[PDB]
Design a protein around this motif. Structure first.
Motif, PDB file in Angstrom:
ATOM      1  N   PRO A  81      14.236   1.236  -6.648  1.00 38.66           N
ATOM      2  CA  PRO A  81      14.374   2.717  -6.544  1.00 38.66           C
ATOM      3  C   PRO A  81      14.514   3.208  -5.086  1.00 38.66           C
ATOM      4  O   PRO A  81      13.718   2.877  -4.189  1.00 38.66           O
ATOM      5  CB  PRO A  81      13.075   3.253  -7.174  1.00 38.66           C
ATOM      6  N   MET A  82      15.539   3.992  -4.872  1.00 37.62           N
ATOM      7  CA  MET A  82      15.965   4.351  -3.536  1.00 37.62           C
ATOM      8  C   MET A  82      14.959   5.182  -2.746  1.00 37.62           C
ATOM      9  O   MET A  82      14.893   5.048  -1.515  1.00 37.62           O
ATOM     10  CB  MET A  82      17.305   5.075  -3.614  1.00 37.62           C
ATOM     11  N   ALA A  83      14.153   5.981  -3.439  1.00 42.26           N
ATOM     12  CA  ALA A  83      13.339   7.021  -2.794  1.00 42.26           C
ATOM     13  C   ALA A  83      11.890   6.582  -2.724  1.00 42.26           C
ATOM     14  O   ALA A  83      11.015   7.380  -2.396  1.00 42.26           O
ATOM     15  CB  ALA A  83      13.411   8.321  -3.589  1.00 42.26           C
ATOM     16  N   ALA A  84      11.619   5.330  -3.086  1.00 44.45           N
ATOM     17  CA  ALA A  84      10.252   4.882  -3.231  1.00 44.45           C
ATOM     18  C   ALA A  84       9.632   4.527  -1.823  1.00 44.45           C
ATOM     19  O   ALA A  84      10.303   4.248  -0.843  1.00 44.45           O
ATOM     20  CB  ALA A  84      10.175   3.719  -4.199  1.00 44.45           C
ATOM     21  N   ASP A  85       8.330   4.537  -1.785  1.00 44.70           N
ATOM     22  CA  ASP A  85       7.552   4.139  -0.651  1.00 44.70           C
ATOM     23  C   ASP A  85       7.415   2.610  -0.711  1.00 44.70           C
ATOM     24  O   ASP A  85       6.776   2.064  -1.656  1.00 44.70           O
ATOM     25  CB  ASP A  85       6.165   4.763  -0.815  1.00 44.70           C
ATOM     26  N   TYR A  86       8.005   1.947   0.284  1.00 43.52           N
ATOM     27  CA  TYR A  86       7.936   0.481   0.496  1.00 43.52           C
ATOM     28  C   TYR A  86       6.983  -0.049   1.606  1.00 43.52           C
ATOM     29  O   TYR A  86       7.148  -1.172   2.114  1.00 43.52           O
ATOM     30  CB  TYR A  86       9.314  -0.080   0.721  1.00 43.52           C
ATOM     31  N   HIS A  87       5.983   0.748   1.955  1.00 45.97           N
ATOM     32  CA  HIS A  87       4.942   0.325   2.889  1.00 45.97           C
ATOM     33  C   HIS A  87       4.015  -0.586   2.137  1.00 45.97           C
ATOM     34  O   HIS A  87       3.971  -0.670   0.887  1.00 45.97           O
ATOM     35  CB  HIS A  87       4.147   1.527   3.477  1.00 45.97           C
ATOM     36  N   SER A  88       3.209  -1.257   2.922  1.00 40.09           N
ATOM     37  CA  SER A  88       2.445  -2.340   2.439  1.00 40.09           C
ATOM     38  C   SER A  88       1.426  -1.895   1.426  1.00 40.09           C
ATOM     39  O   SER A  88       1.183  -2.580   0.450  1.00 40.09           O
ATOM     40  CB  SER A  88       1.827  -3.046   3.623  1.00 40.09           C
ATOM     41  N   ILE A 119       1.585  -7.131   3.551  1.00 37.83           N
ATOM     42  CA  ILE A 119       1.114  -6.673   2.205  1.00 37.83           C
ATOM     43  C   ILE A 119      -0.139  -7.349   1.756  1.00 37.83           C
ATOM     44  O   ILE A 119      -0.967  -6.759   1.046  1.00 37.83           O
ATOM     45  CB  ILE A 119       2.178  -6.907   1.118  1.00 37.83           C
ATOM     46  N   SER A 120      -0.289  -8.636   2.084  1.00 41.05           N
ATOM     47  CA  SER A 120      -1.491  -9.345   1.687  1.00 41.05           C
ATOM     48  C   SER A 120      -2.781  -8.812   2.367  1.00 41.05           C
ATOM     49  O   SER A 120      -3.837  -8.786   1.734  1.00 41.05           O
ATOM     50  CB  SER A 120      -1.331 -10.851   1.954  1.00 41.05           C
ATOM     51  N   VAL A 121      -2.675  -8.427   3.640  1.00 36.68           N
ATOM     52  CA  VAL A 121      -3.758  -7.735   4.375  1.00 36.68           C
ATOM     53  C   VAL A 121      -4.093  -6.391   3.722  1.00 36.68           C
ATOM     54  O   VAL A 121      -5.242  -6.095   3.578  1.00 36.68           O
ATOM     55  CB  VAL A 121      -3.429  -7.490   5.890  1.00 36.68           C
ATOM     56  N   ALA A 122      -3.065  -5.603   3.368  1.00 35.13           N
ATOM     57  CA  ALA A 122      -3.163  -4.303   2.684  1.00 35.13           C
ATOM     58  C   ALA A 122      -3.914  -4.484   1.404  1.00 35.13           C
ATOM     59  O   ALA A 122      -4.940  -3.857   1.188  1.00 35.13           O
ATOM     60  CB  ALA A 122      -1.791  -3.743   2.414  1.00 35.13           C
ATOM     61  N   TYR A 123      -3.489  -5.456   0.617  1.00 42.32           N
ATOM     62  CA  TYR A 123      -4.145  -5.810  -0.611  1.00 42.32           C
ATOM     63  C   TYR A 123      -5.615  -6.181  -0.408  1.00 42.32           C
ATOM     64  O   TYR A 123      -6.511  -5.696  -1.118  1.00 42.32           O
ATOM     65  CB  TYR A 123      -3.427  -6.999  -1.263  1.00 42.32           C
ATOM     66  N   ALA A 140       3.632 -10.315   9.404  1.00 41.70           N
ATOM     67  CA  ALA A 140       3.990  -9.076  10.118  1.00 41.70           C
ATOM     68  C   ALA A 140       2.785  -8.202  10.181  1.00 41.70           C
ATOM     69  O   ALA A 140       1.752  -8.488   9.578  1.00 41.70           O
ATOM     70  CB  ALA A 140       5.151  -8.297   9.386  1.00 41.70           C
ATOM     71  N   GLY A 141       2.931  -7.096  10.910  1.00 36.54           N
ATOM     72  CA  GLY A 141       1.924  -6.007  10.925  1.00 36.54           C
ATOM     73  C   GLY A 141       0.859  -6.112  12.015  1.00 36.54           C
ATOM     74  O   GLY A 141      -0.068  -5.264  12.067  1.00 36.54           O
ATOM     75  N   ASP A 197       4.660  -0.288  10.139  1.00 38.45           N
ATOM     76  CA  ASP A 197       3.522  -0.455   9.227  1.00 38.45           C
ATOM     77  C   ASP A 197       2.588  -1.489   9.892  1.00 38.45           C
ATOM     78  O   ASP A 197       2.876  -2.651   9.955  1.00 38.45           O
ATOM     79  CB  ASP A 197       4.103  -0.917   7.866  1.00 38.45           C
ATOM     80  N   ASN A 198       1.503  -1.029  10.478  1.00 38.37           N
ATOM     81  CA  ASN A 198       0.630  -1.848  11.330  1.00 38.37           C
ATOM     82  C   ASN A 198      -0.623  -2.025  10.539  1.00 38.37           C
ATOM     83  O   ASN A 198      -1.105  -1.120   9.963  1.00 38.37           O
ATOM     84  CB  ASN A 198       0.313  -1.155  12.679  1.00 38.37           C
ATOM     85  N   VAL A 199      -1.167  -3.209  10.511  1.00 36.03           N
ATOM     86  CA  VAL A 199      -2.179  -3.539   9.495  1.00 36.03           C
ATOM     87  C   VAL A 199      -3.462  -3.928  10.243  1.00 36.03           C
ATOM     88  O   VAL A 199      -4.449  -4.339   9.635  1.00 36.03           O
ATOM     89  CB  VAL A 199      -1.482  -4.643   8.679  1.00 36.03           C
ATOM     90  N   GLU A 200      -3.439  -3.783  11.583  1.00 35.88           N
ATOM     91  CA  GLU A 200      -4.564  -4.205  12.432  1.00 35.88           C
ATOM     92  C   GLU A 200      -5.877  -3.492  12.059  1.00 35.88           C
ATOM     93  O   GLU A 200      -6.942  -4.120  11.954  1.00 35.88           O
ATOM     94  CB  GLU A 200      -4.199  -4.003  13.911  1.00 35.88           C
TER      95      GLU A 200
END
Length: 271
Positions: A81-88, A119-123, A140-141, A197-200
């Motif tokens: 979906p084009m308008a979706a949020d793809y952050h972690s 994403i794994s850190v976010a999770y 990343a992040g 998208d910084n996950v620190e």
């Protein structure tokens, strides 16, 4: 003799089956599972542009786990979906949806490469009571063009992303490359989202819950420098760190056997 037959042959050889899960939104996450119901579950998350087949070779050597290997929303065979949020954070929450519906959420091991590491850190930072271990592969992040793909012969991002690329027939690479070209509008959008998208700060919850953490890096990683392991270890002092000489940004593809063996050694140490 066909590319789609080669891609399925690999998946079958790693005891994976593709399924589809319907999110809250109605959007679909396609994912591979090995159906090892007897194993502790492990969620493996791929990086930007990649997809679930980024773990298909390594999945063969992680046969003791109940593997859930998704195409992230935006990627692979999943909805786009084009308008979706793809952050972690948004990506992590959909993955919890999938795992909850399969009854695999409440106790879960988690790994990711590149973006899939952020994403794994976010999770882990959002569901700290449920995540029992964490595997960060050139994540990343952690901040201590040429990632994006317009035409066929841009591929040479290959040379940039790997030091020890494995042999893959040109037709298979070509299907993968078309899939990115077909999705390039959304890929610019997603890159722009995740560049920032910084996950620190979230990673502190990993330290707070003392979640066991294995951090792995290619010494020749030209996408995100190996010096980042200094910063991760600073933020997560319980981290076990392994750097891999002569390997680039994707150890689970370039060094399938060392990477699998290093993780399983970590997993056993936890027992």
């Amino acid at each position: 003799n066909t590319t789609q037959k080669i891609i399925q042959y690999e998946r079958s050889k790693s005891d994976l089956t593709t399924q589809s899960f319907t999110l809250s939104s109605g959007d679909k996450i396609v994912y591979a599972e090995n159906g090892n119901v007897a194993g502790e579950p492990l969620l493996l998350v791929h990086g930007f542009g990649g997809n679930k087949d980024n773990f298909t070779r390594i999945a063969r050597q992680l046969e003791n786990y109940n593997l859930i290997i998704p195409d992230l929303l935006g990627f692979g065979d999943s909805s786009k979906p084009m308008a979706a949020d793809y952050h972690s954070e948004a990506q992590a929450t959909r993955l919890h949806e999938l795992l909850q519906a399969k009854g695999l959420a409440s106790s879960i091991h988690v790994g990711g490469n590149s973006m899939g590491g952020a994403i794994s850190v976010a999770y882990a930072a959002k569901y700290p009571k449920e995540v029992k271990s964490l595997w960060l592969i050139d994540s990343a992040g952690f901040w201590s063009p040429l990632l994006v793909d317009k035409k066929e012969d841009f591929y040479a991002m290959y040379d940039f992303v790997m030091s020890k690329p494995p042999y893959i027939p040109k037709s298979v690479k070509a299907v993968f490359a078309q899939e990115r070209i077909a999705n390039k509008a959304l890929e610019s959008k997603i890159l722009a989202q995740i560049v920032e998208d910084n996950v620190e700060q979230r990673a502190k919850v990993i330290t707070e819950y003392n979640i066991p953490t294995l951090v792995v890096w290619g010494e020749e990683d030209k996408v995100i420098k190996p010096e980042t392991v200094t910063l991760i270890k600073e933020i997560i002092p319980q981290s076990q760190v392994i750097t891999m000489p002569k390997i680039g940004h994707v150890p689970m593809i370039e060094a399938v056997k060392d990477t699998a063996n290093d993780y399983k050694a970590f997993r056993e140490g936890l027992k």
